[PDB]
C-alpha cells in the first residue's frame, strides 16, 4: 500500500505513473524551483501594474 501511496504522490506531483520513484524529491523541489520562478513574475505583473 505504500507503493500505491508513492504512485499517488507521483500523480499529484505531475510525475507520470510508473516512473522513477526516486526522482520525486528532485522534481518536486524543481517544482518549488518553478514556484519561486512564478511569484516573482507575479510581482513583475503587480507592482509595475
Amino acid at each position: 500500500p505504500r507503493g500505491s501511496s508513492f504512485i499517488a504522490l507521483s500523480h499529484k506531483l505531475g510525475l507520470p505513473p510508473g516512473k522513477a520513484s526516486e526522482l520525486l524529491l528532485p522534481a518536486a523541489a524543481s517544482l518549488r524551483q518553478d514556484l519561486l520562478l512564478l511569484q516573482d513574475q507575479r510581482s513583475l505583473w503587480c507592482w509595475d501594474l
Binding site: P17, A20, L36
Partner: protein, 167 residues
C-alpha cells in the same frame, strides 16, 4: 517585522557566508539595498536546505539501490543460480537494451503492461508540449503591430508637439 538594524545584521552575517574568501564591496546605506537582498537570502537559505535534502536523498537512495541489487543477486543465485554472466552475447545484448530503454523511460516496472502506458504517454506529451505554443506566436503579431503603430505615432506626435509650438 525585522527592523533595518536586524536586517543589516543578517546582511553582514550573510556577506561572509557568501563571499568567504571573496572581497566584500561596500554598499550605500539605504533601506532599498538592505531590503532587496533580504528576500534573496531568505529564499537562498530555503533552496539550499532543500537541495541539501535532495543531495542526501540521492546518496541514500544510491546506497539503497546497491543494497537491493546485492540482495536480489543473492536471491538469484540461491533460487535458480542465475548470474548476468551466464547469458550469451544476444541475451546480454537484449538485457542491456531493456536496461537503457528503461533508462530512457526512467521507469521502475519492466512489465509490458507498465511499458505501454509510459510509451503511449511519451509519444503523446512530445507533441503536447509543442502544442498550445502557437497561440503565443499568433497573438504576438497584434501586440507587434500595436506597438509599432503607436511608436511611429509617438515620434509623429513629438514632431506634432514641436510643430504646434512653432504654430
Amino acid at each position: 517585522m525585522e527592523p533595518q538594524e536586524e536586517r543589516e545584521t543578517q546582511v553582514a552575517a550573510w556577506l561572509k557566508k557568501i563571499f568567504g574568501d571573496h572581497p566584500i564591496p561596500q554598499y550605500e546605506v539605504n533601506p532599498r539595498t538592505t531590503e532587496i537582498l533580504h528576500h534573496l537570502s531568505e529564499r537562498n537559505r530555503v533552496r539550499d536546505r532543500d537541495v541539501y535534502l535532495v543531495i542526501e536523498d540521492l546518496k541514500q537512495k544510491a546506497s539503497e539501490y546497491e543494497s537491493e541489487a546485492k540482495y536480489l543477486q543473492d536471491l538469484l543465485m540461491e533460487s535458480v543460480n542465475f548470474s548476468p554472466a551466464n547469458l550469451s552475447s544476444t541475451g546480454s545484448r537484449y538485457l542491456n537494451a531493456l536496461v537503457d530503454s528503461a533508462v530512457a523511460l526512467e521507469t521502475k516496472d519492466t512489465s509490458l503492461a507498465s511499458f505501454i502506458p509510459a510509451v503511449n504517454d511519451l509519444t503523446s506529451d512530445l507533441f503536447r508540449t509543442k502544442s498550445k505554443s502557437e497561440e503565443i506566436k499568433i497573438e504576438l503579431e497584434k501586440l507587434e503591430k500595436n506597438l509599432t503603430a503607436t511608436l511611429v505615432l509617438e515620434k509623429c506626435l513629438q514632431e506634432d508637439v514641436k510643430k504646434a509650438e512653432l504654430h
